[PDB]
Design an enzyme around this catalytic site. Structure first.
Site, PDB file in Angstrom:
ATOM      1  N   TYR A  10      13.323 -24.444   5.381  1.00  0.00           N
ATOM      2  CA  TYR A  10      11.913 -24.284   5.747  1.00  0.00           C
ATOM      3  C   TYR A  10      11.277 -23.141   4.981  1.00  0.00           C
ATOM      4  CZ  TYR A  10      13.895 -27.073   9.464  1.00  0.00           C
ATOM      5  OH  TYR A  10      14.550 -28.059  10.162  1.00  0.00           O
ATOM      6  N   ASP A  46      17.049 -38.595  22.515  1.00  0.00           N
ATOM      7  CA  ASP A  46      17.598 -37.671  21.531  1.00  0.00           C
ATOM      8  C   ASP A  46      17.992 -36.392  22.279  1.00  0.00           C
ATOM      9  OD1 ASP A  46      18.092 -35.780  19.568  1.00  0.00           O
ATOM     10  OD2 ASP A  46      16.356 -36.297  18.337  1.00  0.00           O
ATOM     11  N   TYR A  87      10.383 -33.628  18.045  1.00  0.00           N
ATOM     12  CA  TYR A  87      11.088 -33.384  16.784  1.00  0.00           C
ATOM     13  C   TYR A  87      12.435 -34.096  16.801  1.00  0.00           C
ATOM     14  CZ  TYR A  87      13.828 -30.995  13.196  1.00  0.00           C
ATOM     15  OH  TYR A  87      14.633 -30.713  12.101  1.00  0.00           O
ATOM     16  N   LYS A  95      24.572 -30.701  17.440  1.00  0.00           N
ATOM     17  CA  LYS A  95      24.481 -29.239  17.611  1.00  0.00           C
ATOM     18  C   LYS A  95      25.648 -28.658  18.430  1.00  0.00           C
ATOM     19  CE  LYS A  95      19.579 -28.154  16.592  1.00  0.00           C
ATOM     20  NZ  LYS A  95      18.629 -29.306  16.767  1.00  0.00           N
TER      21      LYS A  95
HETATM   22  C1  LIG Z   1      18.336 -30.166  15.711  1.00  0.00           C
HETATM   23  C2  LIG Z   1      17.804 -31.511  16.097  1.00  0.00           C
HETATM   24  C3  LIG Z   1      17.918 -32.764  15.298  1.00  0.00           C
HETATM   25  C4  LIG Z   1      18.492 -32.837  13.898  1.00  0.00           C
HETATM   26  O1  LIG Z   1      19.596 -32.029  13.666  1.00  0.00           O
HETATM   27  P1  LIG Z   1      20.009 -31.628  12.174  1.00  0.00           P
HETATM   28  O2  LIG Z   1      21.432 -31.273  12.452  1.00  0.00           O
HETATM   29  O3  LIG Z   1      19.155 -30.475  11.765  1.00  0.00           O
HETATM   30  O4  LIG Z   1      19.858 -32.839  11.296  1.00  0.00           O
HETATM   31  C5  LIG Z   1      17.396 -33.933  15.805  1.00  0.00           C
HETATM   32  N1  LIG Z   1      16.824 -33.991  17.018  1.00  0.00           N
HETATM   33  C6  LIG Z   1      16.673 -32.918  17.837  1.00  0.00           C
HETATM   34  C7  LIG Z   1      16.018 -33.030  19.195  1.00  0.00           C
HETATM   35  C8  LIG Z   1      17.166 -31.603  17.415  1.00  0.00           C
HETATM   36  O5  LIG Z   1      17.036 -30.501  18.204  1.00  0.00           O
HETATM   37  C1  LIG Z   2      16.829 -28.758  12.038  1.00  0.00           C
HETATM   38  C2  LIG Z   2      16.658 -27.333  12.520  1.00  0.00           C
HETATM   39  N1  LIG Z   2      17.931 -26.624  12.358  1.00  0.00           N
HETATM   40  C3  LIG Z   2      16.314 -27.433  13.970  1.00  0.00           C
HETATM   41  O1  LIG Z   2      16.170 -28.535  14.446  1.00  0.00           O
HETATM   42  C4  LIG Z   2      16.154 -26.202  14.828  1.00  0.00           C
HETATM   43  C5  LIG Z   2      15.145 -25.278  14.167  1.00  0.00           C
HETATM   44  C6  LIG Z   2      13.776 -25.362  14.814  1.00  0.00           C
HETATM   45  C7  LIG Z   2      13.102 -24.000  14.721  1.00  0.00           C
HETATM   46  C8  LIG Z   2      12.381 -23.819  13.393  1.00  0.00           C
HETATM   47  C9  LIG Z   2      12.715 -22.465  12.816  1.00  0.00           C
HETATM   48  O2  LIG Z   2      13.577 -21.751  13.389  1.00  0.00           O
HETATM   49  O3  LIG Z   2      12.117 -22.113  11.777  1.00  0.00           O
END
Ligand SMILES: *Cc1c(COP(=O)(O)O)cnc(C)c1O
Ligand SMILES: C[C@H](N)C(=O)CCCCCC(=O)O
Ligand SMILES: *Cc1c(COP(=O)(O)O)cnc(C)c1O
Ligand SMILES: C[C@H](N)C(=O)CCCCCC(=O)O
Lengths: 427, 426
Positions: free
Chosen positions: B18, B245, B148, B274
């Site tokens: 990002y 999700d 998201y 995660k």
């Molecule tokens: C973090 C996240 C994803 C995607 O995970 P990545 O490991 O970054 O590809 C998808 N959906 C939700 C709700 C999440 O918090």
């Molecule tokens: C994909 C990404 N690791 C995620 O979903 C969590 C990060 C969301 C917070 C955005 C940030 O910290 O800049």
């Protein structure tokens, strides 16, 4: 769990790749892996077989190599993982420095991700964002040649071969990309001229050309003359279309050069690596790009690259990758691969005379028997196991991509099994 | 490499998430143990609390002896084999655990390497399902705003197009159907409106996809679990699949084992990731019902044509088995309740701060919402001074701490959070 118990749970609850559930194959239980060898359970008995596939082309140093095991346990002791948002660390830095030094010239920036398919999505995002940063958002399509494969996520699927590719049933919902005909094995100037003509008419809507250099893997283990890559580089340059090489299968010595682009002396604008990156220990991939691409991507109004996998630049994966790459570079890998290729060539030659065989070809540590019909796994898998080798054919191909540590004797055992599978195919 | 050498290499060659290249400076991390990171601040190694659980993954903290041992145990027997044609004990042990602890009816597990991939797999499952029913027109997704689901191009298409992180990409993404932002408090009129909008699209919708109870990266918003009960009902009556999700909400984070459990509802398809591996390694999974798996397999298409190279990786599965068993082997529900209480008590004073618009807590999630974007250049060092690693985003100062955090550690975390919010308003 006993192998029996594993099979029961598996049948009840596990979805295997590229398969149905119920009336699916039926997997073989693996209980150990060491060096070039897998321990599998066959009729309730453990058997040792050579991992001729390098576990889908990843285990270049074999399984449980002491240097890679140690690199993993050493990192585990100090730091398993931290978020790459706001933080950096030694394994990420060490791996990035290695990658930018050994890849084709000009690739000075590294974006880590968790898998090959994701790194391809990241490559496309870089290419599309690049042109948005130049105020040319119409440059949004991709071009490729037929016979290709780039992973299984939905953008990656859009550049898979639309007719014979594994994703062909999805073509009606995929982004519609531009496809040149199948690139031939032998060099033909007319093919490159036709490619240029086609690209020229779409140049204003093309962000990038995306191809597997020299070897197309999952699309048919097809090889093409590296001179075509030289032509692509020149065409892309002249018409201002980015060039992307997907080296997720070809990287790290597999085709006889460190990267297949090196056969052509070509540098792409963007490059993907994965699979053998970690020596087959852990999932990791990377997308590299030039400084110009990296700086333009945030030019104009485009802003930051908005991608960030949760486990981006995972210290464990990076640490074993550093060890795997250093192990590769610290030996005479070029002679090793040459010896492997010679062994594959020598051992597969008798297959040419088999009635169901249409071609035998070798490129680096890739050996291929192409057959006149799709290969039945129900026949092939036990035939290979009977000869002490784990083989997994696909399409009409009996092929191997063996670990680099295979002895000449082990290579001959592998080729012998392949020939016998091909013999059985034709009867 | 020294920290200075790491910084040099990083600045020259590493793209961070990002961010832009050459216009964004990361802090060097040299160690992590328990709930603490060792970071390099002005040349000095300091220990700070991982208030973010390393983007919401390290639920048992770092370098937990049980998880370390599980990994090293697996490493000595089998690092990895291809899941094409082979199976193994860690995949089977993990699939069995996940099928047993997830909402009822989810009995099939498709492993992948990341959250975003598991979401694309879920979408593929849903589309292929309706193809197997002779309804290939059912190919769009519906969701609500504020959501998201990851960063790959299909996942991006169900991120909120107005102000979600992928908003600049709307013109190139698949156009999905978006319902309005779901409210915090339960209002049946919202569900009735969702139903009305879904109805007119039902013939072209494969699935509704949402984050249950907590919306994470789209703004740390909470909604009443009864909305999920309504979605289950609407999807059932209109023959649209329901996908939860739970990549952020899974494994106890919201106070229930999975957020769906707050509503007592089962989706047709579910994503996890995660915290799945205790934050050691990248792994994710997509679960579905027997109906979904069988309908896909009976379709003309036949096979689900997806297969990540490192699918069901033994090392990743082995540490996940240990992490899941470690969670189930303890009174996790009390632990989360205690964490929630600590967060509530410590964040209470932020309510009075001039730039603060809301303070909210849900399980082991604590949030201060501000009236303006939070400046990382001010927030990050402020928190580091107080021994805490915090990463705000948008207008949010928030924490998702490891479950092993002591009351003292939670006090320390919340105090840093209050101080960051205080500084935002001046
Ligand atoms: C973090 C996240 C994803 C995607 O995970 P990545 O490991 O970054 O590809 C998808 N959906 C939700 C709700 C999440 O918090
Ligand atoms: C994909 C990404 N690791 C995620 O979903 C969590 C990060 C969301 C917070 C955005 C940030 O910290 O800049
Ligand atoms: C294996 C492969 C990919 C994608 O790999 P996954 O790890 O399965 O996501 C992409 N491109 C090529 C050329 C490959 O061989
Ligand atoms: C698994 C990975 N996605 C990959 O690219 C290899 C697939 C090519 C062989 C297909 C098979 O073995 O069935």
């Amino acid at each position: 769990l006993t192998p029996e118990q594993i099979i029961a749970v598996d049948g009840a609850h596990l979805w295997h790749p590229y398969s149905s559930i119920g009336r699916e194959v039926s997997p073989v239980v693996a209980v150990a892996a060491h060096g070039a060898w897998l321990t599998l359970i066959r009729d309730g008995q453990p058997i040792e077989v050579l991992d001729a596939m390098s576990s889908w082309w990843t285990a270049i140093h074999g399984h449980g190599h002491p240097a890679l095991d140690q690199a993993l346990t050493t990192q585990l002791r100090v730091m398993n993982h931290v978020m790459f948002g706001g933080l950096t660390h030694e394994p990420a830095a060490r791996l990035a420095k290695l990658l930018v030094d050994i890849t084709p010239a000009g690739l000075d920036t590294v974006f880590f991700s968790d898998s090959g398919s994701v790194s391809v999505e990241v490559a496309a995002k870089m290419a599309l964002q690049y042109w948005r940063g130049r105020g040319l958002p119409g440059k949004r399509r991709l071009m490729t040649w037929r016979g290709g494969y780039h992973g299984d996520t939905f953008l990656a699927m859009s550049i898979c071969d639309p007719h014979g590719g594994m994703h062909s049933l999805w073509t009606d919902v995929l982004a519609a990309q531009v496809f040149a005909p199948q690139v031939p094995r032998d060099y033909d100037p007319a093919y490159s001229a036709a490619f240029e003509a086609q690209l020229a008419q779409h140049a204003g809507e093309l962000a990038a050309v995306v191809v597997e250099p020299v070897v197309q893997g999952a699309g048919g283990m097809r090889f093409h003359d590296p001179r075509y890559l030289h032509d692509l580089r020149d065409i892309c340059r002249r018409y201002e279309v980015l060039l992307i090489f997907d080296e997720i299968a070809t990287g790290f010595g597999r085709t006889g050069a460190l990267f297949a682009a090196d056969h052509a002396g070509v540098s792409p604008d963007i490059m993907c690596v994965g699979k053998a990156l970690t020596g087959g220990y852990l999932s990791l991939a990377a997308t590299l790009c030039t400084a110009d691409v990296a700086h333009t991507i945030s030019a104009g109004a485009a802003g930051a690259l908005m991608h960030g996998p949760t486990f981006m630049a995972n210290p464990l994966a990076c640490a074993v990758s550093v060890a795997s790459v250093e192990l590769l570079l610290g030996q005479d890998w070029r002679t090793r691969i040459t010896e492997l290729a010679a062994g594959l060539t020598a051992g597969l030659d008798t297959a040419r005379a088999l009635p169901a065989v249409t071609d035998v070809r070798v490129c680096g540590a890739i050996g291929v028997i192409e057959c006149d019909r799709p290969v039945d796994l129900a026949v092939a898998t036990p035939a290979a196991l009977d000869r002490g080798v784990w083989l997994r054919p696909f399409r009409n191909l009996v092929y191997a991509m063996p670990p680099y540590i295979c002895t000449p004797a082990e290579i001959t055992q592998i080729t012998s099994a392949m020939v016998e599978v091909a013999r059985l195919v034709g009867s």
